[PDB]
Design a protein around this ligand. Structure first.
Ligand SMILES: CCCCC/C=C\C/C=C\CCCCCCCC(=O)OC[C@H](COP(=O)([O-])OCC[N+](C)(C)C)OC(=O)CCCCCCC/C=C/C/C=C\CCCCC
Ligand SMILES: CCCCC/C=C\C/C=C\CCCCCCCC(=O)OC[C@H](COP(=O)([O-])OCC[N+](C)(C)C)OC(=O)CCCCCCC/C=C/C/C=C\CCCCC
Ligand SMILES: O=C(O)c1ccccc1C(=O)Nc1cccc2ccccc12
Ligand SMILES: O=C(O)c1ccccc1C(=O)Nc1cccc2ccccc12
Lengths: 327, 327
């Protein structure tokens, strides 16, 4: 496998649908002037509460939880610990804005620009096309972590930052916020049902499965449409300027993949899992962190710029990493 | 073959998904109080402008236009002429409200409560489940005819009624209103591409087909969700009143199917096409007529009540007609 032009063409053909399903939303929100800002928020609200949860359930319910590789989980833990260590070290010698501010604020804006890629909508098709169906069952293990263990911790830290800017009270507030999250319930039920379907042999009734599919189908396309609407909402792609966009992208597409490579070497992962993990780490930034930043107002411009430009540059960077890892 | 409890169970299993995809929207708009009126309006706009056109294209491009049986088209013409004649006769004898309202206005109110059922969203799944895939290729003929000729004549009639309350000026205004419709463009390109595909042998490129599917997939589910939102919008199911609701249901589910039976007998249709036509005529009322009524303010209450109550009572009538025609 020399990465001939045929493979790159196949990846491009697999990724074009989810880019033309996004340019449509961008044009509708910006050029065609089809949706009002409140109307745009209506679509953005429906998708994140009906398609992302149902899509997450339909993606996580089709995996034997007992087959989850502990090595990949430990590699994820090690990566998201090393990134924290490096962020703490760098923030001790170079404040990004100069003027002193909450260190935890800059460590929470970090860990959202570095080690929380988009692994449901914009990250599943690309990796599946690049590495076939083998890699589609590996992201299905990292998505579970990102939805259960990492986003809950990020929410708790966001609440802590909002309060600081009793610990038990903060934990209780984070719990209340989490209980009303459709995605956490969807992924929890997905794993609980996958356990049953793979151990006891239970199968979803035709009615239930088809009802779930009706809304799950098109979840990727409409999620990309909503992401395009979000891009159209912003006045300019580079919200904070060149200085904080180059650094954002350098972090996301170097310190993430590089730290994942270091973690894999420490854990000594294997082929068909090392490359998948690295590409996952190299995926564009996720959206949920942007939602948290907007809700708690923690540098929304930086995270929005990172998300938008990383999503735009997904194909170049992802193809570059795919070519590099095959040497 | 025949009628038995297992067949009814299969029909119910095929229809339940598109009812639980609608109760979700109803609850989100009314009970859960999830969407503000502007947000639900935006969702409705998005679906009607992106999923209905794309779904129509993906449904009409598959069948062969050259296989369109002229007998079914002639039967549709005869039905929608007989309904006009009967409506004109009855209106002269007995005015519905007695307020000396415009006869043309009530005729336009008719021809939509009678002979314009929902054949894309709520008509294709039910009929396909009842009669397998044979009926799915017969509805597409009626679907394309309704989208092209009948929904253009109805638009022209609405414009004429609005002006009545120059003929060339009215035709020009109707043309302007028709041009901006995306559904008309989608249903036209559907045949323009099906002709090439079935005659010239051309096939959609993988990229184009997958891009179309991304948004077409789940179009039925989100269309039912939008229909549920619309149902939740209205304060009560029976808007105009009990008498008007009863008259609307009686018309839609007796005069439509009865006139279609008369037209089929006149044209002498055949088995596997007669029953499909009758059930199609017995489907619940369509939505586009409600959109026109709301835009031009032509008895929105009666049409909305008919649409909602037909959607709720779709199965008790479709199954009844299926049982009746199998004797
Ligand atoms: C606060 C205390 C009460 C907490 C809730 C209590 C109990 C658990 C709830 C439900 C049980 C069913 C499964 C979980 C669904 C959770 C749905 C959910 O979170 O409801 C609320 C959520 C809306 O969000 P919000 O409330 O923040 O609105 C805020 C709106 N404003 C900001 C404008 C005010 O609604 C949505 O997300 C829409 C629905 C999303 C559904 C996602 C799960 C999909 C699962 C499928 C599995 C199906 C079948 C399995 C069958 C197995 C056996 C055969
Ligand atoms: C008035 C003078 C200009 C008239 C138009 C001129 C030329 C024809 C246009 C386009 C050609 C491409 C195909 C047709 C697309 C038509 C799209 C359309 O109607 O744009 C407008 C429509 C939005 O409506 P509005 O503007 O009334 O909004 C008003 C909103 N407010 C009131 C708030 C301001 O946008 C939408 O619906 C969104 C897009 C819907 C797309 C539906 C068609 C899908 C087709 C698929 C076929 C694909 C591939 C085939 C490949 C073949 C070769 C291999
Ligand atoms: O993209 C992420 O951040 C992510 C990563 C792993 C698991 C889940 C998610 C996730 O909920 N995405 C999204 C949430 C809400 C709205 C979204 C709209 C578009 C794309 C992703 C969305
Ligand atoms: O349902 C109809 O009236 C119909 C019948 C035949 C062909 C097309 C249609 C049609 O455009 N429906 C719809 C239009 C706009 C929004 C809709 C939302 C939900 C369901 C149907 C819709």
């Amino acid at each position: 496998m020399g990465i001939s032009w045929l493979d790159i063409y196949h990846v491009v053909s697999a990724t074009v649908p989810l880019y033309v399903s996004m340019t449509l939303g961008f044009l509708s929100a910006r050029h065609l002037k089809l949706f009002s800002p409140e109307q745009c928020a209506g679509i953005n609200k429906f998708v994140a509460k009906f398609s992302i949860p149902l899509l997450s359930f339909q993606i996580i319910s089709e995996n034997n939880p007992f087959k989850m590789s502990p090595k990949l989980i430990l590699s994820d833990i090690l990566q998201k610990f090393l990134v924290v260590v490096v962020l703490a070290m760098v923030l001790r010698f170079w404040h990004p804005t100069g003027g002193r501010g909450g260190k935890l604020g800059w460590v929470i804006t970090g860990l959202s620009i570095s080690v929380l890629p988009n692994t449901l909508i914009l990250g599943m098709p690309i990796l599946s096309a690049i590495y076939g169906d083998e890699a589609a069952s590996i992201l299905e293990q990292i998505v579970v972590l990102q939805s259960l263990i990492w986003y809950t911790i990020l929410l708790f830290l966001f609440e802590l930052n909002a309060a600081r800017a009793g610990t038990m009270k903060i934990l209780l507030k984070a719990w209340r916020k989490l209980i009303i999250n459709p995605n956490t319930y969807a992924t929890l039920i997905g794993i609980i049902w996958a356990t049953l379907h793979f151990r006891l042999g239970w199968n979803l009734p035709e009615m239930i499965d088809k009802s779930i599919h009706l809304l799950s189908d098109g979840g990727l396309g409409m999620a990309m449409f909503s992401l395009g609407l979000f891009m159209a909402s912003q006045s300019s792609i580079i919200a904070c300027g060149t200085k904080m966009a180059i650094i954002t992208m350098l972090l996301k597409f170097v310190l993430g993949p590089a730290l994942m490579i270091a973690s894999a070497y420490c854990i000594r992962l294997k082929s068909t899992l090392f490359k998948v993990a690295i590409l996952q780490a190299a995926l564009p930034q996720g959206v949920v962190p942007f939602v948290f930043a907007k809700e708690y107002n923690l540098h929304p411009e930086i995270i929005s710029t990172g998300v938008i430009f990383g999503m735009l540059i997904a194909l170049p960077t992802t193809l570059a990493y795919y070519f590099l890892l095959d040497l």
